[PDB]
Structure formats: C-alpha cells, structure tokens
Amino acid sequence: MIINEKYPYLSYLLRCYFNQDFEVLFGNADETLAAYKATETAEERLQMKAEIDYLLALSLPDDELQDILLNKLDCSYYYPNEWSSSEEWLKHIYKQMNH
Amino acid sequence: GGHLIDRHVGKTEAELLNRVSTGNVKSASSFTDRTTAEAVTSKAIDSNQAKIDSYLSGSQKGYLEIDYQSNVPIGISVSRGSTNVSSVTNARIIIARDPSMPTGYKIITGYPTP
Numbered sequence: 001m002i003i004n005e006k007y008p009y010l011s012y013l014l015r016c017y018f019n020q021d022f023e024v025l026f027g028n029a030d031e032t033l034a035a036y037k038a039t040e041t042a043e044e045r046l047q048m049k050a051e052i053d054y055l056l057a058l059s060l061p062d063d064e065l066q067d068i069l070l071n072k073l074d075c076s077y078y079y080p081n082e083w084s085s086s087e088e089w090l091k092h093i094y095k096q097m098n099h
Numbered sequence: 100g101g102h103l104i105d106r107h108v109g110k111t112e113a114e115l116l117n118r119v120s121t122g123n124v125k126s127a128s129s130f131t132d133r134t135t136a137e138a139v140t141s142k143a144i145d146s147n148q149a150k151i152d153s154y155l156s157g158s159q160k161g162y163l164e165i166d167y168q169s170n171v172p173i174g175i176s177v178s179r180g181s182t183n184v185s186s187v188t189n190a191r192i193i194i195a196r197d198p199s200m201p202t203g204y205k206i207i208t209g210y211p212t213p
C-alpha cells in the first residue's frame with residue numbers, strides 16, 4: 001500500500017490545500033483551512049477529522065508524527081515554526097473546522 | 100491573476116533557497132524549463148485521464164491531485180535546514196473544476212516532487 005490510499009482525506013488537505021503556493025492561493029495557514037472548510041462538503045471535512053483522530057489516538061513520538069505529516073502525506077507548510085508539536089497543530093486543524 | 104505553475108519553472112537555486120529559509124514551506128521545487136514543465140503536465144494529464152473524467156462527472160471536490168512518476172530528472176528541489184539541491188524525477192499537478200474551460204478544468208499549479 002501507499003499512505004495516500006489509506007489516508008486520502010488528510011492527503012487531500014495537505015497536498016492540494018497546503019501546496020507550495022498556499023500563501024498566494026489562500027493566505028496564511030488558517031486562511032487556507034478556512035478556504036477548505038468553505039469549499040469542501042461537510043462529509044469531506046468529517047472524514048478528514050476522522051483521519052486526524054486515527055493519528056492523534058496513537059500518541060506517537062513527535063518525530064514520527066512529523067515525518068508522517070511533512071514527508072509521507074507531504075504537507076508543504078512547515079507548521080513546526082508556529083507549533084510546538086505535530087499533535088498541537090493537528091488539534092488546531094480539528095478545532096478550526098468547528099462553528 | 101497569474102498562472103501559479105510559473106512560480107515553479109526555471110527558478111534559481113537562490114530563489115528556492117529563499118523560500119525555505121525566510122518563507123514558511125518545508126521545501127520548494129522547480130521544473131528545469133518551460134519545455135519540461137509542459138511535457139510533464141501533458142503526460143500527467145494523459146496518464147490520469149480516467150481519474151480526471153471521474154472527478155469531473157461525479158465529484159464535489161474543489162481540486163484534484165494528479166501525480167507523475169518517472170526515472171529522468173525534470174527539475175530541482177531544496178529543503179529547509181540544508182542548501183543541498185536535489186534532482187527530482189516525479190511531479191504533482193493540481194487542477195480545479197472549471198466548466199468554462201474546454202477540458203472542464205484549469206491547472207492551478209504544479210511542481211516536481213521528491
């Protein structure tokens with residue numbers, strides 16, 4: 001298998017929205033999250049949130065979770081410059097989805 | 100606006116390295132030249148035409164990722180924390196549904212991927 005076969009919802013956020021041009025297309029990381037929320041269906045974001053939960057529940061060592069987000073799922077946004085850990089950034093994405 | 104793929108054609112090492120230090124991306128990449136960017140874009144669309152066709156007819160997604168794999172360098176990449184320039188053989192194109200275009204989509208951006 002390949003990781004995006006089993007994590008397609010997070011792969012979609014991290015590759016299509018957090019592409020290398022996210023600052024020009026959408027703006028800052030939270031404006032990017034807002035564009036995703038506005039554009040995509042409720043079903044899409046609930047399935048993305050479910051994938052976040054599959055990751056968070058494992059309590060991985062931060063270096064492993066960071067390799068997953070940055071290298072395997074291939075996020076272009078270097079969130080560690082704003083966030084102390086990969087867990088904290090994922091919890092932030094999750095919360096940004098709410099009302 | 101502009102065509103964002105052009106942010107990833109023929110860029111200098113200096114330009115890419117600036118994006119990964121002062122900028123906020125983990126890595127930055129660029130196709131070698133326009134002929135290469137065009138060739139890769141066309142091959143990626145043609146090899147994913149089934150996926151594009153399903154996307155246009157059945158999907159409410161805002162965008163679609165289409166990937167290109169090869170064993171021949173099509174550009175360069177740099178990563179945060181290092182000045183090493185890597186040659187890269189794969190690529191990613193992002194399209195969006197756009198009924199006004201003849202194909203039904205527009206190319207949002209694209210670039211090499213390690």
Ligand code: NA
Nearest residue numbers: 169170188189
């Ligand atoms: Na390759």
